[PDB]
From a paper:
Take for example the glycolytic enzyme triosephosphate isomerase (TIM) from two evolutionarily related pathogenic parasites, Trypanosoma brucei and T. cruzi. Many of the proteins of these parasites have a high degree of sequence identity; in the case of the two trypanosomal TIMs it is 73.9%, with a sequence similarity of 92.4%. Both enzymes are homodimers whose three dimensional structures superpose with an RMS of 0.96 Å and both have an identical catalytic site in each monomer formed by residues K13, H95 and E167 (based on the numbering for the sequence of TIM from T. brucei (TbTIM)). Of particular relevance to this work is their remarkably different susceptibility to sulfhydryl reagents like methylmethane thiosulfonate (MMTS): the enzyme from T. cruzi is 70 times more sensitive than the enzyme from T. brucei. The initial site of action of the thiol reagent in both enzymes is their only interface cysteine (Cys), which is at position 14 or 15 of TbTIM and TIM from T. cruzi (TcTIM), respectively; it is surrounded by residues of loop 3 of the other subunit.
We therefore designed a chimera of TcTIM with regions 1 and 4 of TbTIM (TcTIM 2,3, 5–8). This chimera and WT TbTIM exhibited almost identical inactivation profiles at low and high concentrations of MMTS. Taken together, the data with chimeras TcTIM 1 and TcTIM 2,3, 5–8 it may be concluded that, at most, the 13 different amino acids in region 1 of the two WT enzymes account for their different susceptibilities to MMTS at concentrations higher than 50 µM. In order to check for the absence of major conformational differences due to the sequence perturbations on the chimeras, we solved the crystal structure at 1.65 Å resolution of chimera TcTIM 2,3, 5–8. The analysis of the structure shows that the chimera can be superposed on the crystal structures of TcTIM and TbTIM with a RMSD of 0.385 and 0.437 Å respectively, with a minor displacement on the loop of region 1. A displacement in region 6 is also observed, which corresponds to the amino acids of the flexible loop involved in enzyme catalysis. Thus, it can be suggested that the disparities in susceptibility to thiol reactive agents between the different proteins produced by changes in regions 1 and 4 are due to the effect of their side chains and not to any major rearrangement of the main chain. When the pKa of the thiol group for Cys 14/15 of the wild type enzymes and the chimerical enzyme TcTIM 2,3, 5–8 were determined anew, under the same conditions, the values turned out to be 9.27, 10.53 and 10.61 for TcTIM, TbTIM and TcTIM 2,3, 5–8, respectively. Altogether, the data show that the relevant residues of regions 1 and 4 modulate the reactivity of the interface Cys through long-range interactions and that the interface residues do not play a role in the susceptibility to MMTS.
Residue numbers in the entry:
A (entry chain A): 4 to 172, 179 to 251
B (entry chain B): 3 to 172, 179 to 251
Write the structure that this text describes.
């Protein structure tokens, strides 16, 4: 397996006090194995997190971006993130696909720009319950992945990370099967080396209680964690990637 | 007669730490000796540095957008997160968000109601496109935008409401005044003499040091929501035009 990633998606949550307490815990947590930890605060909380986080095994990510600075009231661009020394970004999260009109095309454009600008990107994919029940999981997630892949160069794949979100929800067996589906497509289109090096993270419900059983699956390379990542239990989730 | 004017700077999706720190230094050194509320709206990422450095007593800091509630909304910032950070102004319904980011009248209205409820001053943006104006639908469009917001508010909320008119279709000062007057008269009919007289309606078209005074001169214009010029020293002259 490639180097695992334990990523904390704080989503639209946090106060200065609560996040300070949580970051202090992360700072006192000794990460001793080969794992890349990532924390993704809201834009407003990035400066405070950057100033307070000292743990050398952690990188800070944005939860979204648009490609270029300009007349886009309310948005934050990759240019602005880079100026602030942020080099990781989560794109295509199921909530943005749902609420904020992010189509396969929009996601692909964002991903292409980010990796070309040297960002590591966590690209989110996943199918609905209606799509899963119809037997269309592979058709849907590979269409999502194909849209993103069409832009990317060989070298760009070193900075791509995929996160599978079972929007339909999951067992580790079910998760592992979709991760196999994704990796198979990549192997077929981009070759054995890129497929072997690619991190595919599980982005469903992850807790201290289920993280080890998930990480043990052959094609799961870590997690994009929701609610648990605002809690001290995130420590146990990082430990599950040994 | 006119209520306190507002000069608001919408920085949009722009700025580096360096460029904004120079801008903030300039604003800090600018002496302003008349009653005016200045507002600067940085990107979310730049709000912390602006809060820590901005000192000019005439200025407040605003967000360029927000969502109603905290939770599972990856990529967004909520009103409560802004309030915890000590931000008390917000721009909502900007034309770029209505056009690019799916903000309907109802979505804007829900956000505005939530912001007022949580103690924010809100600059609520309305405005019609070229297609709409050419069709003779200016009034219908802006009053529909306005009425949708008003429906979710009651008279008490209005002390914290500011309207900004964006002539997206582009304007002469007379063209601006025509819309501002139509807006204020609608408010007067629905909320009464006092609310309508005290309401700030800002012009949010192209404002420059050159044209600002002529605009401020119109009866129903109470200041500006400024785009590109707000990233420049020219903004200083625009503030002066509200004197």
């Amino acid at each position: 397996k490639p180097q695992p990633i334990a990523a904390a998606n704080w989503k639209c949550n946090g106060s200065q006090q609560s996040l300070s307490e949580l970051i202090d815990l992360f700072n006192s947590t000794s990460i001793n194995h080969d794992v890349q930890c990532v924390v993704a605060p809201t834009f407003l909380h990035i400066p405070m997190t950057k100033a307070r986080l000292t743990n050398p095994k952690f990188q800070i990510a944005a939860q979204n971006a648009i490609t270029r600075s300009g007349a886009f009231t309310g948005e934050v661009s990759l240019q602005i993130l880079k100026d602030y020394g942020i080099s990781w970004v989560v794109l295509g999260h199921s909530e943005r696909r749902a609420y904020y009109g992010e189509t396969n095309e929009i996601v692909a454009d964002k991903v292409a720009a980010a990796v070309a600008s040297g960002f590591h990107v966590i690209v989110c994919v996943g199918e609905t319950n209606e799509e899963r029940e119809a037997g269309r999981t592979a058709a849907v997630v590979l269409t999502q992945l194909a849209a993103v892949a069409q832009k990317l160069s060989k070298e760009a794949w070193s900075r791509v990370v995929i996160a599978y979100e079972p929007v339909w929800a999951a067992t580790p067996q079910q998760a592992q099967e979709v991760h196999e589906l994704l990796r198979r497509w990549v192997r077929s289109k981009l070759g054995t080396d890129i497929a072997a090096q690619l991190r595919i993270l599980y982005g469903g419900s992850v807790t201290a209680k289920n993280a080890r059983t998930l990480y043990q699956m052959r094609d799961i390379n870590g997690f994009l964690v929701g609610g648990a990542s605002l809690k001290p239990e995130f420590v146990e989730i990082i430990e599950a990637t040994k």
